[PDB]
Design a protein around this ligand. Structure first.
Ligand SMILES: Nc1ncnc2c1ncn2[C@@H]1O[C@H](COP(=O)(O)O)[C@@H](O)[C@H]1O
Ligand SMILES: Nc1ncnc2c1ncn2[C@@H]1O[C@H](COP(=O)(O)O)[C@@H](O)[C@H]1O
Lengths: 684, 684
C-alpha cells in the first residue's frame, strides 16, 4: 500500500528514482554473490529491451490490422464483392467494367444506371456512414470511454508524469482499436495516424506489467511509454527517425539521454513489423505514400512560402475555431448527448461528402491522389487535359471548382469532428486540407505558366516540349505546412514528411513552408493543437516552453495567504491519534510537512496522505516522529527552496528533477509549500 | 568585475541562467515599447544562429586548409615536383614513369636506382619527419602550449562547466591549425580528425565574442561550443548526423533540447563548406573515403564478431598501456624534455615505418587502401594474385607478413605517440589498427575459402566463377570495432561509420562488431580513452554515467570534519573590515555562507570570494549584511540539501541544474557545504 499513486494526480519523479535505486541496490548486493545473481541482473537489465521490442511488435501488428480493417470497412460503404465477400474494392477490381464487384444499387433495383441507382447508392452510403459512426461511438461510450480523441494531448501529460488509470489498459486498447477502425470507416473527417500513438502507448503499458521492474515503478513506465510513442508515430507514418524526433519533441517529456536508442529501436521494430503486413503485395509503404523525382525551381519558393502562410492561418484558425467549439461542447447540453452528436456529425458529413467525388474518397486515398502527378493514362476530372505545358478544357475549371468546395468542407467539418466521443485523429484531416490547398496552388501555377509562358518570369526556366510544374509537390508541401501550423512542429514534422514521402530534393521547400506556417501561426498564439487541448481539458501539464513572465519569486506562489487558514503542519511528539484523525477528516491536502514545535516552526521532514492513512489503519488494527512510531514512512529529505529563490529556478527544478512539491523555508523557518498545481495555476 | 570566473574553475550554471534571465527581462521590457526594440530583440535572438553559422563556416574552411596543407607536407617527405613546386605527389603524377615528380635521391646523386638512391631517400624521409615534428612541437611549446593532444578530453570537461582560459583563444587556434598540419605531415602515429573538434570549438569561442549575448554569459557559450563540437566532428568525418550524435553522446554535456537544431545546422554548414573545398576535382568526400556495393553472408558474422573481440581487447589494451605511459610521462624526467620526446618518437617512427610500405604511407592513405577491394588493374603487393576464388602466390604470403608488422608497429607506436606535446588524434590511428586487423581477417577468410571451398560451410553460399568474400568490408568493420573499443562509442560511432562510408547493407556487421568491442572492453573497465585521460589529468569531470556505489547520504560527503577547523561562515551585522580581511587572508575558500549568529547558525545566504573582495576594495577606495553594506552582491538563494538527503539526488541536481556548490542544513541549522570537488573526490 505504501508508495502508491491515487487517481488523477501528478507523479513525483524523485521518489520513483529513489525506489529504483533501492531495487538496484537490492539486486546488486546479490549480483556478485553468485553467477545466478549475475544472470538475474542481466535479465532484469534486458527487461527494458524486451518490453520495447514487444511494444514495437504489437504496434506494428495492431496498426496493420487497423489499416486492413479500416480499408475494408471504408470500401464496404460503396459495394460488395460477390465472388469473395472478404476482399475490398481495390482487391476485387484488381482480381481479374467488373461484374464480380457490385454496388448496392445494382443489388436492390437490378439496374446499374438511372436516377434510382444514384438515389439508392447515396442513401446506402449514408446508411453505412451512420451505422459505423453509431457503433463506434456507442462502443466507446459503453466499454471504454477513454478511446475518444487522438489521445496525444493525454499521452503528453502522462509522460509529463500525470496518471490516468485505465488510459493505457487492455479494455481501452481493445475498444480504441475496434472503434478507431469503425470511425475511420464511418467517413468522419478524422484520421488514424495520431491515435496510433495512443495504441502504441497502450501496448507499452500492457507489456510493462509483464516485468515487476516496470509494473511497480512509474518513471520507468514513463520511459517505456516514451519509447512506445516513438514507435506509434513511426508505425503511423512509417518514419522511424521521424517518429523518434516526434517523441523527443512533442510527446516525450523526460529524457535520460539513453532511451533514445530504445525509442529508435522501438520505431525500427514497429516499422519492420508493419512492412511485413503485406499479404496481397501492396507496393505502398503507407496508404498515402508517394515519391517524387521531378525538379523544383527558385520561383516556386514564392508560393511554397504562400502555402506556409496558409498553413499558418488555417492552423491558427483551427485552434481558434476547434477549441471554441470544444468549449461549447462542455458548456452546453450538446455534451449530454455524445452519441447523438456523433450521429448528427457523421450524417452531415456523409450527406455533404457524397456529392463531391473528392470528399467521398477516404481521406488517406484523397491525400494519395493529391500527391500523385497527372500521368498519361489518367482521365479523371483531376487531370482532364486536351508549348511546354498542356492545354486544358472545362475539366480543369470544374476540378478547381470541386477542390475549393472540398477544402471548405474539410476545414469546416474537421473543426466540428475533432473533439467528438470516438477515436479521431488530426494528422490525416490536416494533411488533406494542406494537400487540397497545395493542389489548388499547383494547378493555378501550371495554368498561369501555360497561358503566359511568354512572360520573362517563366521564359528563363520552363523548357518547350516538357512539363514545367508539378502540383503534387505543392500538395505535399501544403500538407506539411498545415500539419506544422496546427501542431506547431518544425523539425520532427519535416523529418516525418521526408521519410513519409521519400526524396531529399524538397527539403528546402518543406523546411520553408513549415517554418512559415509555424511563424504565421505563432503570431496568433504559440499554442499547438495538443497544447491548446491540454489547456482546455485543464490537465496539469508543465509546458517545457512556458515562460514565467512575472518577475516574482517563490514568495508570491506559496499558498498560505492572509485569507487562508494557518499552514497545515505536523508536530513532532505531542500529537495523538485523535488529533491526526480530526485534522485529516477536516482537511483536504495530499501531504503534510513535519516541524519541531509550534513556537519553533523548524522543519523536520515530509509525510504523505495515503501512506500515513495506511500506517494509521495498520496501527489501529494491530505518536512520535522522533528517533506508536511513524519514523519509517516519513519522507525525511523533502526539497526546500528559499522564498527569495526566483520562480525560474523552481520551474527548472520541477522540470528536471520531476518534483511534485517543494517546501519553502525562511532562515530555517518553514513558511509554505509549492506543488505542481500551485506553479500551474500561478503561471496562467 | 562582479560575476566573473577564475581560471581552472567550474561554472555554476544556475547563476549564469539567472543572469541570462535578467538580461532577457531587460531586453523584453523595451521590446514592446517600439518597433526598433523588436528589431533589436530579433537580432539578439538571431545572434545564436549567426555564431553557429560562422562556426560551421570556419570549421569547414579550416579543416579544408588543414587537409590540403597536411597532404602537401606529407607528400613533401618523399619528393618534389620540378615543373611546379606547389603540387603534391598525386597532383603531379596525375598532371600528364613521370619526369616532373622527382625524389630526392635522383636530385642528389643523379641516379634513380641502386643502394645509394634508397639510402638517400631513407635518410631524407627521416630528415623531413624529424624537421616537421620538431617544428610542430617547438611551435606548440613556445606559442600555444594548449594545442597538444586531441583536445576532446578537455573540451568534454569545458562543456561540463570547466573553465580553461586560453584553451579556445586565437593563439591556441592558430598554433593548433599549423602544428596539427605539421604533426600529421611529420608521420607520427596520430590523426587530424579528433583534433578538428578542438578547432571547431576554438572557432565557436572566438565567434561568440562578437556578440555581447555570449561573451559575458558562460552557459550560452557552452551551448555554442556544444554545437561547435558537432560541427567539428561532422567536418572531421563528413558526417553531419554522426557528428551531432557524437556531440550529444560524447562531448556535449548540457542539452536544453533546443540546440539540437543548432548542432545539426552547424554540422550541415561545416560539411557544406568542406565539400566546396575541391579546387582540383577530387572524387572523395574525405581522404579515407570508400563505398561498398558487395554482399555479406551470415557466416561472415562470426569473424565480424571476432574483430569486435579484437576491437575490445586492443581498446582495453590501449587505455591500459597508453594511460600507464602517459602516467610515466608525468612521474619521470621524460616530462621535462617534451621537445626531445617528440624528436625521439618521430625519429623512431620514421626509421621503423619507412622499410614497410604499409606504414610508410600516410595513415589516411593506409585506411583508404584498406577500405578498397582488389581491382583487376591492381598489381600491388596487397593484391598479388595469379574456382569461385582466385589463386594466390608468394605475394599474398608476403602481404600478410607485412600487414602483421604494420599492425604491431601501429599498436605499439600509438601507445607512445598519443600523449606527446603536439596536436595528436586517436580516430585515425585507431581506425588504421582496426582496418589492418580487418584486412588480415578478410584475406585469411578469402584464402580459406579458396583452398577449402569443398567444405559444406562455404559450399552453400559461394558461387563458382565469382568472388565470395570482400576484405575491404572486414577492414571497415574492424576500424569501427577498434574505434568503439577505444572510445566506447556505440551508436554515434556507428552513424559516423555510416556517413563516412556510405551504404546501409552493412548495419548488422558494424553494429555487431561495435557492440562486441564495447562489451569486451567493458569487461576490463568501462572507461573510454577520453575519460581515462580526463581521469589521468584529474579534470573535475562529473561523468554522466558514474554511479555512487556507496549507499551513503549527503552527510558523509560533508567536509567539515572532526580533524578540520570549524566551518567557515559569516555573521550578519557584527563583523568589521579587519575581521573579513584577516579571515580572507588566512583562509583559502571560494565561497562563504552567511548565517544569523554564532549561537543560532541560522542560514541567511551565500557570498563569493571574488565579488566580495572587489566590493571591499571599492568600499575602501571610495559592515552589515542586513536589510558599509554588501546587500547587493549577496546571494539570497543558495541551494540547500538536508544531510539525510541521499547522494544520488545531490549528483542528479548537480548534473541537471549545473550546481557548483550546495549548502547542507540540519533542521534549519547550517552544517556545511558540498562543492563539485567534494562530490568528485568522494566519488573516486
Ligand atoms: N501541508 C500543506 N499545508 C497547507 N497547504 C497545503 C499542504 N499541502 C498542500 N497544500 C495546498 O493544497 C493544494 C493541493 O494539494 P496537492 O494536491 O498536494 O497539490 C496545494 O497546491 C497547496 O496549495
Ligand atoms: N565557506 C566554506 N567553509 C568551509 N568549507 C568550505 C567553504 N567553501 C568551500 N568549502 C570547502 O572547501 C573545499 C574547496 O572549496 P572550493 O575549492 O571553493 O570548492 C571543498 O571541500 C568545499 O566544500
Amino acid at each position: 500500500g505504501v508508495g502508491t499513486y491515487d487517481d488523477f494526480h501528478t507523479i513525483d519523479w524523485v521518489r520513483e528514482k529513489c525506489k529504483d535505486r533501492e531495487r538496484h541496490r537490492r539486486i546488486n548486493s546479490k549480483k556478485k554473490e553468485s553467477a545466478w545473481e549475475m544472470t538475474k541482473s542481466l535479465y532484469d537489465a534486458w527487461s527494458g529491451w524486451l518490453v520495447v521490442t514487444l511494444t514495437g511488435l504489437a504496434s506494428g501488428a495492431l496498426a496493420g490490422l487497423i489499416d486492413i480493417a479500416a480499408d475494408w470497412m471504408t470500401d464496404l460503404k460503396e459495394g460488395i464483392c460477390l465472388s469473395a465477400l472478404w476482399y475490398n474494392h481495390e482487391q476485387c477490381c484488381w482480381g481479374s467494367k467488373c461484374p464480380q464487384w457490385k454496388t448496392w444499387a445494382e443489388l436492390i433495383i437490378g439496374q446499374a444506371e438511372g436516377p434510382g441507382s444514384y438515389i439508392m447508392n447515396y442513401i446506402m452510403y449514408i446508411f453505412w456512414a451512420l451505422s459505423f459512426a453509431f457503433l463506434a461511438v456507442s462502443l466507446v461510450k459503453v466499454f471504454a470511454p477513454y478511446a475518444c480523441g487522438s489521445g496525444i494531448p493525454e499521452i503528453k501529460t502522462i509522460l509529463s508524469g500525470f496518471i490516468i488509470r485505465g488510459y493505457l489498459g487492455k479494455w481501452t486498447l481493445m475498444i480504441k482499436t475496434i472503434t478507431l477502425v469503425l470511425a475511420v470507416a464511418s467517413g468522419l473527417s478524422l484520421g488514424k495516424e495520431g491515435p496510433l500513438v495512443h495504441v502504441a502507448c497502450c501496448c507499452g503499458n500492457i507489456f510493462s506489467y509483464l516485468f515487476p521492474k516496470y509494473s511497480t515503478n512509474e518513471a520507468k513506465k514513463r520511459e517505456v511509454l516514451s519509447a512506445a510513442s516513438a514507435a506509434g508515430v513511426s508505425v503511423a507514418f512509417g518514419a522511424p527517425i521521424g517518429g523518434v524526433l516526434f517523441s523527443l519533441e512533442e510527446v516525450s517529456y523526460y529524457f535520460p539521454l539513453k532511451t533514445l536508442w530504445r525509442s529508435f529501436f522501438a520505431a525500427l521494430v514497429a516499422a519492420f513489423v508493419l512492412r511485413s503486413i503485406n499479404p496481397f503485395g501492396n507496393s505502398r509503404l503507407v496508404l498515402f505514400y508517394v515519391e517524387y523525382h521531378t525538379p523544383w525551381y527558385l520561383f516556386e519558393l514564392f508560393p511554397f512560402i504562400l502555402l506556409g502562410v496558409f498553413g499558418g492561418l488555417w492552423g491558427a484558425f483551427f485552434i481558434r475555431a476547434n477549441i471554441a467549439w470544444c468549449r461549447r461542447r462542455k458548456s452546453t447540453k450538446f455534451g449530454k448527448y455524445p452519441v447523438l452528436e456523433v450521429i448528427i456529425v457523421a450524417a452531415i458529413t456523409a450527406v455533404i461528402a457524397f456529392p463531391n467525388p473528392y470528399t467521398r474518397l477516404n481521406t488517406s486515398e484523397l491525400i494519395k491522389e493529391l500527391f500523385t502527378d497527372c500521368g498519361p493514362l489518367e482521365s479523371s476530372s483531376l487531370c482532364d487535359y486536351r508549348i511546354p505545358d498542356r492545354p486544358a478544357g472545362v475539366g480543369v475549371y470544374s476540378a478547381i471548382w470541386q477542390l475549393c468546395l472540398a477544402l471548405i468542407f474539410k476545414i469546416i467539418m474537421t473543426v466540428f469532428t475533432f473533439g467528438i466521443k470516438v477515436p479521431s485523429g488530426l494528422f490525416i484531416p490536416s494533411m488533406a486540407i494542406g494537400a487540397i490547398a497545395g493542389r489548388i496552388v499547383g494547378i493555378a501555377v501550371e495554368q498561369l505558366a501555360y497561358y503566359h509562358h511568354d512572360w520573362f518570369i517563366f521564359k528563363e526556366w520552363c523548357e518547350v516540349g516538357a512539363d514545367c510544374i508539378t502540383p503534387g509537390l505543392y500538395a505535399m508541401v501544403g500538407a506539411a505546412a498545415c500539419l506544422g501550423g496546427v501542431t506547431r512542429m518544425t523539425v520532427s514534422l519535416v523529418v516525418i514528411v521526408f521519410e513519409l514521402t521519400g526524396g531529399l530534393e524538397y527539403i528546402v521547400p518543406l523546411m520553408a513552408a513549415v517554418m512559415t506556417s509555424k511563424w504565421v501561426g505563432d503570431a496568433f498564439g504559440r499554442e499547438g493543437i495538443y497544447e491548446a487541448h491540454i489547456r482546455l481539458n485543464g490537465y496539469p501539464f508543465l509546458d517545457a516552453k512556458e515562460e514565467f513572465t512575472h518577475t516574482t519569486l517563490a514568495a508570491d506562489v506559496m499558498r498560505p495567504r492572509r485569507s487562508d487558514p494557518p499552514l497545515a503542519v505536523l508536530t513532532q511528539d505531542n500529537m495523538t491519534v485523535d488529533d491526526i484523525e480530526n485534522m485529516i477528516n477536516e482537511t483536504s491536502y495530499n501531504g503534510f510537512p513535519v516541524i519541531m514545535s509550534k513556537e519553533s516552526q523548524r522543519l523536520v521532514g515530509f509525510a504523505l496522505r495515503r501512506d500515513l492513512t495506511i500506517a494509521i489503519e495498520s496501527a489501529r488494527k494491530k505518536v512520535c516522529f522522533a528517533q506508536l512510531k511513524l519514523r519509517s514512512i516519513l519522507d525525511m529529505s523533502p526539497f526546500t527552496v528559499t522564498d527569495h529563490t526566483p520562480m525560474e529556478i523552481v520551474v527548472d527544478i520541477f522540470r528536471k528533477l520531476g518534483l511534485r512539491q517543494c517546501l519553502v523555508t525562511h532562515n530555517g523557518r518553514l513558511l509554505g509549500i509549492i506543488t505542481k498545481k500551485d506553479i500551474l495555476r500561478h503561471m496562467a
